[PDB]
Design a binder for this molecule. Structure first.
Ligand SMILES: *[C@@H]1O[C@H](CO)[C@@H](O[C@@H]2O[C@H](CO)[C@@H](O[C@@H]3O[C@H](CO)[C@@H](O)[C@H](O)[C@H]3NC(C)=O)[C@H](O)[C@H]2NC(C)=O)[C@H](O)[C@H]1NC(C)=O
Ligand SMILES: *[C@@H]1O[C@H](CO)[C@@H](O[C@@H]2O[C@H](CO)[C@@H](O[C@@H]3O[C@H](CO)[C@@H](O)[C@H](O)[C@H]3NC(C)=O)[C@H](O)[C@H]2NC(C)=O)[C@H](O)[C@H]1NC(C)=O
Ligand SMILES: *[C@@H]1O[C@H](CO)[C@@H](O[C@@H]2O[C@H](CO)[C@@H](O[C@@H]3O[C@H](CO)[C@@H](O)[C@H](O)[C@H]3NC(C)=O)[C@H](O)[C@H]2NC(C)=O)[C@H](O)[C@H]1NC(C)=O
Ligand SMILES: *[C@@H]1O[C@H](CO)[C@@H](O)[C@H](O)[C@H]1NC(C)=O
Ligand SMILES: *[C@@H]1O[C@H](CO)[C@@H](O)[C@H](O)[C@H]1NC(C)=O
Ligand SMILES: *[C@@H]1O[C@H](CO)[C@@H](O)[C@H](O)[C@H]1NC(C)=O
Ligand SMILES: *[C@@H]1O[C@H](CO)[C@@H](O)[C@H](O)[C@H]1NC(C)=O
Ligand SMILES: *[C@@H]1O[C@H](CO)[C@@H](O)[C@H](O)[C@H]1NC(C)=O
Ligand SMILES: *[C@@H]1O[C@H](CO)[C@@H](O)[C@H](O)[C@H]1NC(C)=O
Ligand SMILES: *[C@@H]1O[C@H](CO)[C@@H](O)[C@H](O)[C@H]1NC(C)=O
Lengths: 465, 465, 465
């Protein structure tokens, strides 16, 4: 039980320092790197509306009917351009519960002109109130934005031309270009400046690696260390994935490797002389010194790894207080933990249901990483094939799609700690105003005392008071 | 400020890969490995039901009462085996809102038959709004699972014979009968198909290590690297922890280590001849190339370490928003933090209570890793001796013994984020149903006002009429 | 859905073992280390109480009211010293629900004497159900703790004299008098026993490193590895940070480094003899064995790195359930994730408000690491210059200065998971007492019905009698 105070201070965390090893290899080889730079240069736009024309008066006349139409209008090229620069839809006016006798604005105005909105979702409603006259209802839909769909870089020609492929999810490219109608899936898209990229030259260190480590006089090929990986650059061809391409030209050479020395075989260097024991001792001392340097580097790396391990264990032991399934997850087991103190804790086993294809077990649902009871009959997602992504993969998707499905974004659908953050104030108000305690017992009965007894009191007043 | 849009997608996480170093050592030494086979061969099952029988019989009379029971049942041998074979339960019928006037169905079934499910969770609901009749509700339960058994493997030296021991909770061998039913703590579990092991042969790399490092001509012993540790396999004896044993036979020998070269001393195998400078140059160049390869490996390892460090720092700075004591714990200080932005934050000091043998401080208790005010007198645990374990200690938590059969628990005792997950729906209902706001002031006085004056007015006006 | 039985066990996490590499370097160089000794010599204490006085004096009369006061006191020198010596408190008597008709004991004590505890937390309760007499409640608070002092050590080169400095919040030297009482922010602090330091000699390993990597016959300077860093000790001067200082004496030198061997140049020491191919191949074999040892060390280090990588991925996957923003933050994106199974999940795009110098965004406010709708018109903070710190910066947060003794705080101002931990009991009570369900109707009207219908019942009573 500590104390809060008025003493604070602004701060910002700085990453731990990792000292580099001493005597880094000399970098003497040039490498050509080509990758796509950063630019949005995409537009996505759409627009729709609603219609509802109804009439009555006979209950069997064909004019006595109700109708509704789905009509989505494609958006023009300059229309999209100025929707982008102006961030507004060239949308039409909205007519609500309009008596149709002399106002044909719901029949002569279909293209949609004049109204500029930040974005509008159409609403479906009908009107059939005029028992003898006509009436009409209208709605509208807006959409415009920019996007950054992830793209791959391809440089296959030996003539060194490169051009991006703006591909959609699942890995398929989509034929997209400036000032050409696409108008697919009820959306229209425009991109500016096509796309650009950069080229640069970087020095690196390269060595010749034997193919067969257990075969003397084997085949060797060049390898270079670029950022944190060793690439094979034996052939002077472009080799790349994602959007970053690597190339090593042929004029830049790689130092050769001497073959193993053995007696009864000529030893490359031809200088007839006499070797003395002092030379042997000198060479031996030099090589011992080199081994000493390598050992020092090894020890430095070991110290770094030890520091990281200690930090990670402290992190997990601190976090485990909130998440009680962390220890079991790290142990490939199924247990839950409760802490008696800051370092001591207990354990408690859990079971595992059989394999299943969804997240529903007969009034049980999976949410927030736990299995809880459920009463909503229809909230169940059937599992299908799944994509597979790594952390390093950028794959910025922001995929465009128009949704016209019933499911809504009600506040009750919030993930972990979003619910708490959003409802902290409401929960505080509920606890405070409703002063929890044994005072309010209106819950002990049904609405009978609320309505019928109040009506009885009102009648009592009226006819006796 | 984002919201919920129409865009989603199913995904899965792939662990980051670590590139192995080049020119790995050659494995040409044989090692014997013995370990127990992986088999669950432990069956778990449980079953229960919930019943609520109520009869108000009108209001304002002592006959109004709601009573409910929760029961736990045992599962027989044949039923448990059939469940394990079919991966299903065999459970009764669900009764909801049954009129206790001609439907007393909640009294004619006590075993539970008719329905086969893959798993079910009980939902409890009671109501007695109808006063002219009775009413009752019923629910049910399910469960089936398998788990591995806590065991240990040992092997003798003279006989080369191995056997598996079954361990209890604290880690001692016990007798357990195969293919029998044991009821304890509200569950029924069966052990079958006693454990078995296997043997295999694995190639590995071994070398000789001096005992006294800074003394030439010292004792050397064989060391081998198996998975991530170096073992002293100088002696030909079994040595193993948990359940996996390692042994190197005598006939599998390791190559010798040549002594350090010195002048005025015969240099191992000799070939009378005269050495020249060129041979020395060739040898020197070859050794320089080897050192270059080792340096490249060092650089790659350092790059990997840096990558991991950056990832860990990003992880902690993202996580620290929820856990306010993480930064203090990592700094070995006692402070709490609040965030003004995505990366900036403040700090605030805290105190530390003295040493105590329990987790109670005069109306204060330690729960969920925080010190909070306590009013419950009888909740205090006296600390005892603790046993320390690592993450990879290979321990199990299901044990087929005999014990007390009654089981009981409450929903109020839930660890971190299990309480929130289980009571999310109740929180939503509590917040929404009673509109948080200043309208209902019936709580301003005692519980009498709702019934006393109401009945007084009713009776008074009835006999005044 | 798992279970939660009555089987448990105490435990404590043990750190993962990291084996050191074999055949480490030789430590033979003496290094002088000076640092400040460890001790708290800072005393922190506080005391307060809570009191509530209530007298309804009947119901629905203008003489009913409850008033509560929360007070903070000061601690004298002798009292604080005695508390520090005994490690206990001297707190007042607890009064619970005292009848005020002849017992108004909540006015006879204001200092607080009689009770000695190891730490107490107040709980506040009020009740005025008795309309015929007075009533009052009282509670109490205390605390005692010790902490280290934020300091820094410096030494001079010429005189070899070291002095300890006492630092303020920003990190500047200040005068603090010893053995005196300083009151600020409702707490009393005493500083005693000004700090000291110590000196010792530590062996280490040192080597000479070329200033330029590829320049033969360059300048070499000594470098030594202490714990996890390599320090330049070419000059014999003090150089240090925080409070720990390192010095290498002049007489303790480091051995030399032989230069590169070339032909046509005499090779350091000379022993006239003739070399044979046997000597060359012996040297070659010895050096190859050394390279093999280095390779084994490399492989062990790689295994360690892979183990930590796997552990970290398991940790992040397990924790991502509670923190939905972690995955997006790791990839540098703006998405939130919801999980369908324990490993599969969805992704949900989000936008980001522009960066500013405040935390207010026109009815959108940033709290608990999320952007939520803002209802408080005046709650804004302007960002200032930020300082950056590392985890290992050795910074304290208790500073014995002089300030105002007024303190104030609210229970509604709690950080992440402190609010939940502190209000778990109140949430449970609110859920249980207020039976969440569809019975309540007093919320459907306004506070008028409280008095209107009681007046109507009074009129009915007057009419009937
Ligand atoms: C994490 O992602 C952020 C965006 O989600 C990155 O922030 C952007 O980095 C861009 C670097 O390519 C920069 O945008 C461009 O910056 C250049 C020069 O400053 C200018 O051309 C423009 O400002 C901008 N380009 C365009 C077409 O507008 C910015 O630094 C920044 N953009 C923002 C904030 O809008 C982070 O860099 C990234 N962090 C990483 C990768 O570590
Ligand atoms: C602990 O980690 C394991 C991997 O790190 C998870 O994977 C389990 O491994 C089991 C043995 O390797 C496998 O189960 C069966 O193994 C036999 C042995 O060869 C195979 O013939 C079977 O096909 C295989 N599966 C079945 C259904 O029999 C599985 O790979 C896997 N077991 C599962 C998924 O049940 C373990 O799951 C994990 N333990 C946990 C999470 O409790
Ligand atoms: C994280 O902080 C802990 C406390 O804040 C540290 O634990 C204290 O470490 C001190 C020294 O490392 C020790 O305190 C005193 O040490 C001297 C050494 O000479 C002993 O004689 C004293 O008996 C000992 N105790 C006192 C009261 O003087 C203790 O090991 C310990 N003190 C406690 C627990 O009260 C951790 O070391 C620190 N972790 C780090 C720095 O990695
Ligand atoms: C589980 O729910 C399904 C509906 O999909 C139902 O057919 C089945 O009977 C239920 N199982 C039970 C209640 O055991
Ligand atoms: C287990 O049973 C065996 C009989 O095969 C017996 O020798 C052994 O002592 C028993 N272990 C116990 C009782 O711990
Ligand atoms: C603190 O707890 C002890 C042990 O329960 C009790 O004897 C003492 O009176 C308490 N202190 C109070 C109530 O001030
Ligand atoms: C077994 O433990 C339960 C737990 O409360 C208890 O009710 C029951 O009486 C115990 N059985 C025996 C035989 O003591
Ligand atoms: C502390 O007091 C001494 C003596 O007056 C003074 O020399 C020193 O500068 C003071 N420390 C400060 C001001 O930080
Ligand atoms: C704040 O103002 C901007 C206009 O500059 C607007 O786009 C944004 O939605 C506003 N924030 C709100 C309404 O929460
Ligand atoms: C201390 O706070 C009080 C109000 O709580 C204020 O009046 C006074 O000026 C403050 N003193 C200082 C030195 O800030």
């Amino acid at each position: 039980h500590c104390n809060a105070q008025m003493k604070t201070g602004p701060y910002k965390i700085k990453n731990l320092d990792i000292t580099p090893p001493k005597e880094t290899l000399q970098k003497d080889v040039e490498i050509t790197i080509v990758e796509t730079d950063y630019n949005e240069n995409v537009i996505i736009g759409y627009k729709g509306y609603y219609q509802a024309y109804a009439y009555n008066g006979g209950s069997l006349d064909p004019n006595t009917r109700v109708e509704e139409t789905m009509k989505t209008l494609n958006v023009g090229k300059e229309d999209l351009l100025m929707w982008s620069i102006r961030q507004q839809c060239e949308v039409g006016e909205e007519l609500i519960d309009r008596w149709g006798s002399d106002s044909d604005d719901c029949f002569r105005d279909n293209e949609g002109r004049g109204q500029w909105v930040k974005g509008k979702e159409l609403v479906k409603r009908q009107n059939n109130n005029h028992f003898a006259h006509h009436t009409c209802n209208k709605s509208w839909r807006c959409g415009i934005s920019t996007s950054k769909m992830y793209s791959r870089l391809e440089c296959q020609d030996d003539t060194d031309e490169c051009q991006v492929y703006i591909l959609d999810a699942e890995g398929n490219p989509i034929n997209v270009t400036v000032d050409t109608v696409l108008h697919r899936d009820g959306v229209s898209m425009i991109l500016k400046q096509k796309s650009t990229f950069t080229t640069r030259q970087i020095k690196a260190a390269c060595l010749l690696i034997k193919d067969d480590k257990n075969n003397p006089e084997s085949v060797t090929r060049e390898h270079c260390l670029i950022d944190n990986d060793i690439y094979d650059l034996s052939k002077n061809t472009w080799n790349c994935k994602f959007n970053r391409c690597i190339k090593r030209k042929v004029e830049h050479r790689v130092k050769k490797r001497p073959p193993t020395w053995r007696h009864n075989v000529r030893a490359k260097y031809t200088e007839g002389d006499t070797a003395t024991k002092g030379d042997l001792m000198h060479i031996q001392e030099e090589l011992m010194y080199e081994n000493d340097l390598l050992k020092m580097n090894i020890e430095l790396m070991h110290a770094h790894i030890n520091k990281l391990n200690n930090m990670l264990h402290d992190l997990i032991v601190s976090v485990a207080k909130v998440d009680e399934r962390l220890i079991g997850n790290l142990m490939n087991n199924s247990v839950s933990s409760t802490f008696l103190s800051d370092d001591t804790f207990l354990l408690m086993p859990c079971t595992n249901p059989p394999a299943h294809t969804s997240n529903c077990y007969n009034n049980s649902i999976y949410k927030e990483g736990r299995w809880v009871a459920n009463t909503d009959s229809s909230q169940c997602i059937d599992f299908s094939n799944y994509k597979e992504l790594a952390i390093d993969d950028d794959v910025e998707f922001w995929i465009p799609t128009i949704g016209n499905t019933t499911y809504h974004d009600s506040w009750k659908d919030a993930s972990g700690w979003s619910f708490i953050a959003q409802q902290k104030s409401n929960l505080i108000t509920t606890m405070e105003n409703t002063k929890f305690g044994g005072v309010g017992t209106s819950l002990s009965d049904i609405t009978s005392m609320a309505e019928g007894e109040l009506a009885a009191k009102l009648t009592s007043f009226m006819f006796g008071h």
